[PDB]
Amino acid sequence: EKYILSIDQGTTSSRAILFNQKGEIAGVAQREFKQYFPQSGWVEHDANEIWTSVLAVMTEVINENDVRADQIAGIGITNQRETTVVWDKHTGRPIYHAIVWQSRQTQSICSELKQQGYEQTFRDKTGLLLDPYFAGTKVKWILDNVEGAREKAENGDLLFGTIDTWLVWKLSGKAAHITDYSNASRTLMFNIHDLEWDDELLELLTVPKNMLPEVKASSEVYGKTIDYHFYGQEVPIAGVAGDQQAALFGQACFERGDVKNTYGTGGFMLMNTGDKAVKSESGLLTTIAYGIDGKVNYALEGSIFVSGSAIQWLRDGLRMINSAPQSESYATRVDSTEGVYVVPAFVGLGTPYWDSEARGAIFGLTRGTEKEHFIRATLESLCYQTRDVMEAMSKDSGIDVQSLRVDGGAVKNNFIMQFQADIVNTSVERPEIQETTALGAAFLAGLAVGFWESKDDIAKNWKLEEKFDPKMDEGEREKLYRGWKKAVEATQVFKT
């Protein structure tokens, strides 16, 4: 009996999942790694700790689930997008921390180009915009701030790569330095319209072309694992794609109209737009969904920087709760937040505001406000934000979603699901297997090595765990939303 090992290197933890022929989870292993906040707005990881974590979950899932390494037909790698890494080709070590997709430490770089009118250029080519959110400015940051980098890059001693690249490069023993369309399209360097590194964007980002990896399809055998990194086995690595794109795939969203929403560190709703890249006029991102079978699908994306990450904050920042699940208890202990709103713009505001300078704020507080209200308010933010992007997309698409499929870590919190159904007046469908990112990447690989004959097995296996129906008249609905919007304005007013 064979299996497909999937690695989901997320923003706050790494995960290894085994899938049997039937598309069931044969095992799961998870390890968190440190998050660094050196200065307000900044967010960084330690590339070496990420590697060792991914290397850890693998070893774990194999041992704890009684399955040989020689039973892995293939490996799929899906990851936190944009997070940049720059290492020494030879010593194989990062020359500096990985600047996470959330970090605002490249703001000035953006402001420079933005002030030179180049934003429009980046929008027309990358389908993105000039926000510190994307890989491009992070490389430039490293080459301009990290001593020696500039000259090491000129001597062809350095390599760039988003997490997908970083992992595959290490796992294959430096055999392959590649990335797929989806990941590449989130770098501000890749021209998503002609599908190739844009020379102009590179010069404009003062980034050498020798550091870039080869851009390949999302379901292809990029190589094999080196024996010592996989228990003496050379297992093929045949799947790569950004976590959210892989989730899209995992939800069986293969053509126009298909929309899904993921609640992880951040909140991300993507819609498959087929092979016709669609331009957004409401603050959505135009990006590549995935490359498979000679085709290249595009998609519209709505990005929320902080979603579940706001609960983690309640836990690690304010030490107000011990675990994410505990939050629900408080939230369900009060009829409402009684006027209190929480805008988690910890790293600016994404779709549709796109405000890098905005920071987390809280409003409507009164002597009577207590934990229950405060925590509940935080939980509700994941919903108010989803609506923000949901309506923004409903207008750039014209399509009107009526039953959204969800997934991610936070989707198991029932209050969040019901309140989401209510606040949007739409049904929310939660799957039996909520780890769709993992599942998605597993298929990109399984299909590439013939573990599965067709992607449709995914649509067929999808099982609804529970649907959530709206239970809140307009009266209250729009009142609450009306207030959220005011809360978001006020947030934007606070800037120094």
Next chain:
Amino acid sequence: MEKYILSIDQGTTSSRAILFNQKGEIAGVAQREFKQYFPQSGWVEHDANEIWTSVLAVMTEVINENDVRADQIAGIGITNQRETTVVWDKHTGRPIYHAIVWQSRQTQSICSELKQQGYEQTFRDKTGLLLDPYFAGTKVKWILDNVEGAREKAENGDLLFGTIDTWLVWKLSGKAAHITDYSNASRTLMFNIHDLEWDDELLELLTVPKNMLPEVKASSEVYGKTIDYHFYGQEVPIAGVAGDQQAALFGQACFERGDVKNTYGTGGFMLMNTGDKAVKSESGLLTTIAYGIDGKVNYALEGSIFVSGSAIQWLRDGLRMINSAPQSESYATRVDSTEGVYVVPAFVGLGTPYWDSEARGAIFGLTRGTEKEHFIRATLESLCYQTRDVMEAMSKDSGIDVQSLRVDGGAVKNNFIMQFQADIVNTSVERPEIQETTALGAAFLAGLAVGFWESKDDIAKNWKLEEKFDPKMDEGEREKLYRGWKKAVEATQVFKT
């Protein structure tokens, strides 16, 4: 068997009773809290009956547990939370509704009504206040309008209005006296601080009969004696009433003009004795009576802050984030800065100098790296930023420049706050050895009345410095922080449903 003067400070969240010996020292202290009711957002109400029983409790407590008999009490001094209104049936002797607290924003509409009819300017020239839900007047009309049967009764002479002083003195004297003093009267919005009498016009606008009103009196004067049964068989003279903040002013020796002090309690209040000439303000400060004594009446400029220490108390009761108020200093000093975070505790709107009833509490500058220590520190700092706002507004209206400010109140104990205050305002902060000046002020008003003390001077010659905090930060860092503060406030006023 030496005697003592009993002071009662009926504050916003607790009642206190304090004994004082000839030497002006504390012979004993008793405190006791009472429920704060928040029926709706912005609303604040107390149970007038629970306030009475609490006052009655602390008294019993302070004498029984300090080996001091009731017969050794030369006089009683009563100072209190201002504006809090109580409307009760003269006959039954019990309130017809919770006392509406000074912080309450439930009389908002009423204040708007009058504004839209263009009366605000009238109230300013007469009361020296303005049309904010902060003052008594509107709270009375509110009751008369919203409490079933309230009017039928109010117009039969069956009801009596009263701010806490009037309520306490009336009950304690066994219904013998239904009086108030100038200081308390000036905060009702129905008293003309220039004519020193109730204003018949203001009363008609607030649709408040003149029969419910108590008679204004001096601050130091024997208003009557406590009925035996509410004071252990004795008939002790009640000879001292005055708003809690004014009392603090008097207990700080701020007698002459230009004298300024700041109290850090549930709220933050900065009064400046303007002598005997009510100075007009154009920076958001109030004009009100300091005290009535020696046949004279002093005026003063006030800077008011609805939520100060109350914010720290919220970290405890609300977010159940700290065990005790003083436990906050622990966290604050654990991290070097707030790192961008600010806290604007407009739980019940903003006072001096913004005066925004609609405003609410908000927090800014948050990031994933924001830890619990930063959040609490930003709260402790807000008491200071707020004090600065008030201080600059007064520096203008008075033209005077404070080089060293005297302080008092429950929160002064916290050294972090005291130092940060001195830094952010760039002025020396002086903390007295006996910080409960409010209770000590009421002591002397009573004492001086019953001739327990010769002169008020004693307060000055007996006052002693506990510690003086002096500024210790650069100019750049100063304005940078204050710049963000104002931004925070600015943003906070934008959020209005």
Next chain:
Amino acid sequence: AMEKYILSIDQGTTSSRAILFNQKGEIAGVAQREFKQYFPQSGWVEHDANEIWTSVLAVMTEVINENDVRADQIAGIGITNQRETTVVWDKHTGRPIYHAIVWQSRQTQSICSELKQQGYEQTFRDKTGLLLDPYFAGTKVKWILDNVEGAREKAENGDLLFGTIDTWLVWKLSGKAAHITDYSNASRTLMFNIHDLEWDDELLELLTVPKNMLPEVKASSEVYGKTIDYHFYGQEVPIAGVAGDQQAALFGQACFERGDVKNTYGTGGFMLMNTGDKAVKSESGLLTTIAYGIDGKVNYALEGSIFVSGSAIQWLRDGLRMINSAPQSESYATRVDSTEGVYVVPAFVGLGTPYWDSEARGAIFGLTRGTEKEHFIRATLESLCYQTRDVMEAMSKDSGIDVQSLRVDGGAVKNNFIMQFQADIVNTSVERPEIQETTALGAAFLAGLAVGFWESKDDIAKNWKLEEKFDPKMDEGEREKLYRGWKKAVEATQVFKTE
């Protein structure tokens, strides 16, 4: 708005309470207040008498002012209280010469030992129906007279007055007009002869306590006097009821006839059984004391005492700061199916019925690494029950009667888990009344019946209504298994005794 009410004051070990009662026997208002519990040394337990007075004075002011009831509508006052707690004060100044020594205190131990070693324990039993334990007032008095500087000089000049809480309250509240007590309270002083119904001159000499400090014993339902005006809002309301808190509970439970039994779960756990009017002698560790004095008659009863019951749950809260509130313990207990070998013996101040071991202290057993916080709390909650059973079997012998359904009351009866477990571990039905504060209800009637606010005591029975009956629900094997472990815990607990 012109009905009258009866004010009941229950001055308990950890809190004071004031409760109003209408003609219909319903609660017209309730006011509670706590007071500091002093523990100067291990086993010592003391209150500040002054603080008790001011607390009683507080709940009164509170109950009338916040229930819209004037003082002039109070037909009478009932005063029931924590027993044994001794107070010694100067008649003149009117204030105590030392903290009140609570009934739990073990600071008078040596004194009890001395008397035992002189072979007097049998004497006190035949006379008081008690025994030489630091639990009763007598020894506490001598303790003060012996250890408080100048105590003797003054005690022998008539300058001092002894009194258990009832005496202290009535004296202060009556403005020094009455220095009395009733039979129920008196029988717990160790100086009162429960057979001759009078102070025993011999017992007093042994305790070296002058007869001039003693108050005069009276019936339980009788107008002892009127409250002085200034301590009751200008009114002179009659004080017409006094009786030990537990007895009151017995009366309020309608346990008037012989064979009647009830159990109270408060600071301690007390099981009284009205033995009619014939003091039954015990040989299983139960006490013999006066139930009440009413209608010209005097009833007796057998008592099973437990020093620490709900006080153990209160210890989880104040001591180990392990739970937020008492009722928050049920949450944990029901979270785990069993204690998994763990047992808690709360002999904080020794063991009462049926062990009577002053030297014993609290102990916990059956611990393992797997022992979680839930199990620990559950083990504490369960001890209230085990202890109840120990007392129950001892009484089943001394009376030969078999309880098939026990009535209960007290602060802890609210906790369902404890109720069910009691019903199970004892294998008997437990009945929880709708009005669980029977102790104050009892004091109410003693007063009311005196001042003629009610015709007969029968009303207490006709008006009593069941809230819920708990019925046994576990096998025989499991029952005894648990109880066998309990006794083992107890057995070991008595083995730990330092010098």
Next chain:
Amino acid sequence: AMEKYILSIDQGTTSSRAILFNQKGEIAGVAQREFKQYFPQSGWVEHDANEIWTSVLAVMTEVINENDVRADQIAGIGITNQRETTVVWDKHTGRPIYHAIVWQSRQTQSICSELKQQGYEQTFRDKTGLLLDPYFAGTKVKWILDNVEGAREKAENGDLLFGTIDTWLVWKLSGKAAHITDYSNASRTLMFNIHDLEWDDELLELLTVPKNMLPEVKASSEVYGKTIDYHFYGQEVPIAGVAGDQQAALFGQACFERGDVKNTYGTGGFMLMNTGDKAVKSESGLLTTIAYGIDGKVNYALEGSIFVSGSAIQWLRDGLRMINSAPQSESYATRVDSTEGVYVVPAFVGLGTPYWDSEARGAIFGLTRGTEKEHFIRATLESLCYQTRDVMEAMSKDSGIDVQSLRVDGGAVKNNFIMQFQADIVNTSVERPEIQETTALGAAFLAGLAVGFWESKDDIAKNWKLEEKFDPKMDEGEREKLYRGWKKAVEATQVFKT
């Protein structure tokens, strides 16, 4: 430059640790990773053999990366471990057939009672230098073979292998090349005759354990083989050191001959004394076991065993959720002048030296209404000290020697209160080392010397640096009173049994 290192793995009862030692004997890196503890039924303690492996494999990876050191810079590997803890796996699939039974578990009580009732206890004492307590490996294997379905018949077909953690780790790490154990670890199995040095046939039949499952007993400092490339980043580094954690700590403290005594405060408390090559029989509840095999020599030792020491604080944390971290405990304890009569006897898994009572369980005494966290927690911390004194005196009488300055180490030795009270309660100075992770240091040297990284063991004696000494500051009066009470608390504890 071209600098080498010695990787040391310390597989402890509650966590696995990897430590790098440079030529100078300094720590070049540390990595720790806790693993789950299972308490299926009261008294039972078990670990998941696989999770243990994946943890050790984890700490290795971490220490190497985080500390920027190449795998090819490792001169050698040393493995030290939690003793007695048993593991039984399939020779072929390399999978344990059931959880590892931890040294603490009491789940083999009935087995002990059987043999104990048949008079065989004296047999085991005379041969193993131990006794019939569920604390040792022997009964655990039998438990597995008798209770785990299929085990019996798999063992008869030679499909199963036995091994204490050291063996398990070396067998996995070396790719099944080596299935060995050293003297120290072996001498804690109830199967190894410590007097003639070999698996005792009688004891084996008597434990119904096949001889084909037993590994080879080798010296404590010898190259047992190499790591397979895939379990060590493509490198085949030599595995040249094995020894029970406590023995390794003895060696680490520079206790090489008679008189040398140390005490470790980890999950459990263990004091060992080197008795040279003459195995000394104990008459006061101590254990006679092998210290280590090195240079053709095989030193013996006297050991005092306390099942629960630091493990009692962890309990306050995980069990009662009374504190958030072990270190926090001190805060409370230092906040009161005494426990005011409260005692805590953490017999969570029976009592060891010198009481040896498998039935005993944790108990608490001296409680009153005035007892509060500070007193409760402080009492717990003090138990670590009282228990040490129990064995200290028990050893001072079997040895005749009188210790007057004990060297200490372990996870709980960084808690000053515990060190000062210990000095006080015993009336002896307590010396705390700079490097308190001596177990790792010791194992590292067994390896390092085996591969020639170091020429002699004396380097250990010379590098030892005293971090802080603690002197007694408590008159007999109070001293003897407190201990007197402790003893009573222990008696009372033994009374509670069902």
